[PDB]
Design a protein around this ligand. Structure first.
Ligand SMILES: CCCCCCCC/C=C\CCCCCCCC(=O)OC[C@H](O)CO
Ligand SMILES: CCCCCCCC/C=C\CCCCCCCC(=O)OC[C@H](O)CO
Ligand SMILES: CCCCCCCC/C=C\CCCCCCCC(=O)OC[C@H](O)CO
Ligand SMILES: CCCCCCCC/C=C\CCCCCCCC(=O)OC[C@H](O)CO
Ligand SMILES: CCCCCCCC/C=C\CCCCCCCC(=O)OC[C@H](O)CO
Ligand SMILES: CCCCCCCC/C=C\CCCCCCCC(=O)OC[C@H](O)CO
Lengths: 60, 75, 424
C-alpha cells in the first residue's frame, strides 16, 4: 500500500538522521588513497600499452 | 596448402581444448564468499598445481602464437 | 588506508603480490593486441565511431577495449560474469541449488565449478553468435580479404574465444590467488582505467588547440574529484547501534558494562552488484545490437543505451536495486545478533532473541536505502555533467567511476584489514 511505503520513507529518513558521518581526516585519507591507486594503475597500464604499441609499431 | 593448414588448425583446436581442460581442472580453493581478495599474508605457493601452472602459461603463449600464425597465413 | 597503499609497495610479500598482479595485467593488456583471425579490426573501429555503433560503447568498455580490437578475449571476462549471474538466479530460484549452496564445504565448490564451465560455454556461444550475426553478417562486413561467412570462420572464432576466456578466467583466478585484490574486478578495473590517461592527454591537447574550453574541463575534473571524495565519505559513513557487554543481573534487573556500539555501513563492501547490474544491462544490447539491418532490434538495443535517458534510468534502477539487495543479503541480522550473543553482549532496552533480530533488521532495512540511492546518484550525475560540458566519455561514466572507486576501495580495504592482523 502507498501508506506502507510513505511510512517506510519517513522511518528511513529518521535512520538517515541518525547516521554517524566520518571525520575530515578520514575523507581526505580515502580520497588520497583512491587517487594514488587509480593514478598508479593509470601510469603503469600507460607504460604497458605505450611500450607494447611502440614495439609492435617497430615490427611494422 | 590444404593438409598443412588443416594440421595447423588441428593444432590450434587441440591447444584450445587442452587449455580448457587444464583451466577447468585447476579449481580454486574456495571459502565462504564467492569472490574475495583472500588472505594475502600466507606465502602459500605450494606445489599444488605448479606443473599445470607452467603448462598453462606455455600453452597460452603457444595458443597466442598460433592465433598470430593463422592470422599471418597466406590466401 | 594510504598507509596500506605504501606498505603494499614496501612490504616484500605484498609487493610480490603487486608485482605478480602487474605482470598478469600486462599479459592481459598484451593479449588485447592479439586479433581473432579473419576479422577486419579497421572496419570494426570505423563502425564503432558511427551513430549506430555507439550503443556498443559499454559492451566495449567492460570488454577492456578488447571488443574494439576483437582480441582473443573479445568480450573480456564478461562471459564468466554473465554465467555467474545466471547461476545466482538459479540459486535463488531453484531450491535444490539453494540447498547445495548451504551444504557447506562442498556444494559452493560445485556451484562455482558450474559457473566456470558455464562461463566457458557462454564464451563459446557468444563467439558463435557474434561470428554469425555481426561479423559475417551483411555479406561478411567485418571480414578480411580471403575470408567468407561460413562454418570455417565460425569454427575459428569459437575456438579462439573459448580458449581465450579460458585463459582469461585462469588469469583472473591466479590474480585472486597470488596477487592483491580480486582478479575479475581488477581485470575489469584495468580494462576501464587503461583508457583514462590517453583521453585526458587528448582532451588537454584539444584545450590547447581550442576545441574544448577550459571551464568545462575544470568542471569535469572537479566533478571527478567530487565523485571520489563523495564515494569515499559515504563508504566511511556508518550507523552506530548502542550495545553493552559484561551483562550482570543485580536485584532482579539486568545491568551492563560501559556503553559501546556496533557499526553498520550504509553499503556492504563489494563492487560485485555494480558488475552484475552492468552485465544485466548489457544482455539485451548484446542480443539485439548485432543485427544492424533490423530497426526493431536496434530500437530495443538503443533503449538500454546507458548514454540515452531510458537506458540511463534503467541503469540507475539496476544499480540501486542490486546494491540494496546485496546489502540486505550481506547484513543478515541473525548472524549479527548471534555474534553479539556469543560475545555476551546485548542491546539496552531490547530483549535477546528474535526481537533483537527484528530491531537490527528494521534499522538495516531502513538504513541501506540511502547508500543504494547514493550509488544511484553516482550512476546518474556524470552523464548529465558530460552532456552539459560537452566532454563525453563512457570510461568516465557513472558506472565506470563506480567500478574504479569500488575496486580501489575494496583492494585497499582488504590489504589494510590484513596487514592490521599481521601487526597484531
Ligand atoms: C580452408 C581450409 C579449411 C580447413 C578446415 C580444417 C577443419 C579441421 C577441423 C577439425 C575438427 C574435427 C573435430
Ligand atoms: C610457435 C609457438 C612458440 C611457443 C614457445 C613456447 C616457449 C616454451 C618454452 C619451454 C621449453 C621447454 C620447457 C619444458 C620444461
Ligand atoms: C601472449 C598473450 C598472453 C599470454 C598470457 C599467458 C598467461 C600469463 C599470465 C600469468 C603468468 C605469469 C608468470
Ligand atoms: C527467438 C528467435 C526469434 C527469431 C525472429 C526472426 C525475425 C524475422 C524478421 C525478419 C526476417 C524477414 C525475412 C524472413 C525470411 C523467411 C522468408 C519469409 O518471409 O517467409 C514468410 C512466409 O512466406 C509467409 O507465409
Ligand atoms: C520505466 C522505464 C522506461 C522508460 C523511462 C525512460 C526514462 C525516463 C526517466 C529518466 C530519468 C533520468 O535519469 O534521465 C536523465 C537524463 O538522461 C539526463 O542525463
Ligand atoms: C537518483 C539519485 C537520488 C539521490 C538521493 C540522495 C542520496 C543521498 C544519500 C547519501 C548521501 C549522503 C552525503 C553526506
Amino acid at each position: 500500500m502507498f501508506a506502507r511505503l510513505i511510512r517506510y520513507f519517513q522511518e528511513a529518513r529518521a535512520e538517515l538522521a541518525r547516521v554517524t558521518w566520518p571525520t575530515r581526516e578520514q575523507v581526505v585519507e580515502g580520497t588520497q588513497a583512491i587517487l594514488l591507486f587509480t593514478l598508479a594503475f593509470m601510469v603503469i597500464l600507460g607504460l604497458y600499452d605505450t611500450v607494447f604499441r611502440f614495439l609492435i609499431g617497430l615490427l611494422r | 596448402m590444404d593438409l598443412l593448414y588443416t594440421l595447423v588448425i588441428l593444432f590450434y583446436l587441440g591447444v584450445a581444448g587442452l587449455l580448457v581442460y587444464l583451466v577447468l581442472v585447476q579449481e580454486p580453493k574456495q571459502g565462504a564468499g564467492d569472490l574475495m581478495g583472500g588472505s594475502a599474508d600466507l606465502f602459500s605457493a605450494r606445489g599444488v598445481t605448479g606443473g599445470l601452472y607452467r603448462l598453462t602459461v606455455i600453452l597460452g603463449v603457444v595458443f597466442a602464437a598460433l592465433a598470430l600464425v593463422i592470422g599471418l597465413w597466406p590466401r | 588506508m594510504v598507509k596500506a597503499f605504501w606498505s603494499a609497495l614496501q612490504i616484500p610479500e605484498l609487493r610480490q603480490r603487486v608485482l605478480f598482479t602487474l605482470l598478469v595485467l600486462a599479459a592481459y593488456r598484451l593479449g588485447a593486441f592479439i586479433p581473432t583471425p579473419g576479422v577486419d579490426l579497421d572496419k570494426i573501429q570505423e563502425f564503432l565511431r558511427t551513430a549506430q555503433g555507439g550503443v556498443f560503447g559499454i559492451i566495449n568498455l567492460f570488454s577492456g577495449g578488447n571488443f574494439e580490437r576483437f582480441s582473443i578475449f573479445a568480450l573480456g571476462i564478461m562471459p564468466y560474469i554473465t554465467a555467474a549471474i545466471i547461476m545466482q538466479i538459479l540459486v535463488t530460484v531453484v531450491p535444490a541449488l539453494e540447498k547445495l549452496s548451504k551444504e557447506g564445504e562442498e556444494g559452493r565448490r560445485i556451484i562455482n565449478q558450474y559457473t566456470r564451465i558455464g562461463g566457458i560455454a557462454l564464451g563459446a556461444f557468444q563467439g558463435f553468435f557474434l561470428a554469425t550475426a555481426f561479423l559475417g553478417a551483411e555479406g561478411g562486413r567485418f571480414l578480411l580479404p580471403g575470408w567468407s561467412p561460413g562454418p570455417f570462420f565460425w569454427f575459428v572464432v569459437v575456438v579462439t574465444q573459448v580458449a581465450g576466456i579460458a585463459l582469461l578466467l585462469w588469469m583472473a583466478e591466479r590474480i585472486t590467488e597470488y596477487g592483491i585484490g580480486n582478479g575479475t574486478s581488477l581485470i575489469i578495473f584495468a580494462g576501464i582505467v587503461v583508457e583514462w590517461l590517453p583521453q585526458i592527454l587528448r582532451t588537454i591537447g584539444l584545450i590547447r588547440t581550442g576545441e574544448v574550453n577550459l571551464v568545462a574541463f575544470l568542471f569535469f575534473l572537479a566533478f571527478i574529484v567530487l565523485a571520489f571524495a563523495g564515494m569515499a565519505a559515504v563508504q566511511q559513513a556508518e550507523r552506530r547501534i548502542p550495545v553493552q557487554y559484561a551483562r550482570k543481573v543485580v536485584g532482579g534487573r539486568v545491568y551492563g558494562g560501559q556503553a559501546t556500539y556496533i557499526p553498520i555501513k550504509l553499503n556492504a563492501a563489494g563492487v560485485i552488484p555494480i558488475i552484475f547490474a552492468a552485465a544485466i544491462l548489457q544482455i539485451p544490447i548484446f542480443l539485439a545490437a548485432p543485427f544492424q539491418d533490423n530497426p526493431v532490434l536496434q530500437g530495443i538495443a538503443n533503449f538500454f543505451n546507458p548514454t540515452r535517458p531510458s537506458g540511463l534510468f534503467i541503469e540507475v534502477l539496476l544499480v540501486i536495486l542490486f546494491t540494496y539487495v546485496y546489502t540486505a543479503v550481506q547484513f543478515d541480522p541473525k548472524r549479527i545478533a548471534e555474534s553479539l550473543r556469543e560475545y555476551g553482549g546485548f542491546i539496552p532496552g531490547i530483549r535477546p532473541g528474535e526481537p533483537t533480530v527484528k530491531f537490527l533488521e528494521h534499522i538495516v532495512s531502513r538504513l541501506t536505502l540511502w547508500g543504494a540511492l547514493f550509488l544511484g546518484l553516482v550512476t546518474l550525475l556524470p552523464q548529465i555533467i558530460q552532456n552539459l560540458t560537452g566532454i563525453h566519455s563512457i570510461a568516465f561514466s557513472g558506472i565506470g567511476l563506480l567500478i574504479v572507486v569500488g575496486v580501489a576501495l575494496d583492494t585497499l580495504r582488504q590489504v589494510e584489514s590484513q596487514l592490521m592482523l599481521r601487526s597484531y
